[PDB]
Amino acid sequence: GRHMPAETVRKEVALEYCRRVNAGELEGVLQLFAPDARLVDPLGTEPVVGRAALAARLAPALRGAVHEEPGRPYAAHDGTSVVLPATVTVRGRTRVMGVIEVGEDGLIREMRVMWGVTDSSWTARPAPDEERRKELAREHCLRINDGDVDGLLKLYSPRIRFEDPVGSWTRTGLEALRAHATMAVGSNVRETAGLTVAGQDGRHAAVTVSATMDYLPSGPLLARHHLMTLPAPADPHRALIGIEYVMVIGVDADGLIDEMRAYWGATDVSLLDP
Ligand SMILES: CC[C@@H](C(=O)[C@@H](C)[C@@H](O)[C@H](C)CCc1ccc(C)c(O)c1C(=O)O)[C@H]1O[C@](CC)([C@H]2CC[C@](O)(CC)[C@H](C)O2)C[C@@H]1C
Numbered sequence: 001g002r003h004m005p006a007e008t009v010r011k012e013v014a015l016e017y018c019r020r021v022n023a024g025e026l027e028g029v030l031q032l033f034a035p036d037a038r039l040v041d042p043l044g045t046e047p048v049v050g051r052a053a054l055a056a057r058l059a060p061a062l063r064g065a066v067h068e069e070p071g072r073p074y075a076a077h078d079g080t081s082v083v084l085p086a087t088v089t090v091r092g093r094t095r096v097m098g099v100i101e102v103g104e105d106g107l108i109r110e111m112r113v114m115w116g117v118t119d120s121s122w123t124a125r126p127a128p129d130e131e132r133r134k135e136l137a138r139e140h141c142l143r144i145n146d147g148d149v150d151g152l153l154k155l156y157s158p159r160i161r162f163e164d165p166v167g168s169w170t171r172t173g174l175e176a177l178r179a180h181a182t183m184a185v186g187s188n189v190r191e192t193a194g195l196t197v198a199g200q201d202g203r204h205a206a207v208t209v210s211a212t213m214d215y216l217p218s219g220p221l222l223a224r225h226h227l228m229t230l231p232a233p234a235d236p237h238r239a240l241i242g243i244e245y246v247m248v249i250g251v252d253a254d255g256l257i258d259e260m261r262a263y264w265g266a267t268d269v270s271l272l273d274p
């Protein structure tokens with residue numbers, strides 16, 4: 001039997017990575033990675049590949065007493081992804097989001113740590129492109145909230161490929177995105193942006209989102225796709241569904257969003273009644 005690990009298991013592996021970094025025992029940390037795992041930290045630099053090279057990269061950070069304060073982990077429906085915001089202290093405070101893939105043995109196959117110069121207290125180098133990308137991520141949410149579909153599309157390239165949730169079909173083109181946002185507005189979606197980070201690759205950013213929407217039609221639709229399981233609401237005409245997710249965007253050379261992924265799994269959904 002080979003099987004991909006469940007949402008709950010991936011969430012726990014990401015938290016356990018932080019507990020072991022904090023406990024300071026390098027061998028404990030390394031045993032959480034696959035033998036040929038890849039680490040990219042920060043996003044934009046060369047991958048560190050395999051446990052030997054990971055030992056070389058992490059050894060100094062553990063000697064300097066790095067500390068990772070985990071936030072809330074987010075899953076997906078691809079059997080592998082988990083996203084964990086954290087605050088990393090060492091002088092310095094950095095806000096990061098680790099995008100992690102857990103493999104079939106329960107071990108981290110891959111870890112991509114998104115954080116920019118502008119998410120970090122230990123460097124004051126300016127990165128106006130970072131701030132522009134984070135502001136585009138936030139902007140997506142404001143334009144959904146305001147019911148401004150035409151405006152939302154203005155942020156996106158005609159080449160846009162998006163996946164929501166991670167683990168479903170990749171959708172392409174402004175027409176598919178238009179249809180999503182038009183439905184969100186019809187279900188009174190409200191997206192409240194929390195933490196933002198940027199990559200240092202001239203391209204990525206990410207935002208935690210807390211979203212509410214009308215129970216009808218999304219709840220029964222999504223339950224029937226086996227994407228969530230909620231209790232039955234006392235009043236389905238008034239109830240709301242909450243989804244906590246992280247949206248990752250990729251921005252092209254022209255400043256337009258050409259890639260977008262929303263990370264949430266069944267364990268990131270809830271019924272708000274009322
Ligand atoms: C056209 C909008 C509609 C939608 O995107 C559907 C197609 C997807 O959620 C479906 C159920 C799952 C993903 C999917 C997309 C496309 C194809 C071809 C698929 O096969 C699948 C799939 O998972 O099977 C849904 O989006 C919603 C609009 C309020 C919600 C769902 C949840 C949400 O994606 C949360 C980030 C966001 C708030 O939109 C509800 C609505 C039923």
Ligand code: NA
Pocket residue numbers: 117118119120121122123124125
């Ligand atoms: Na900074």
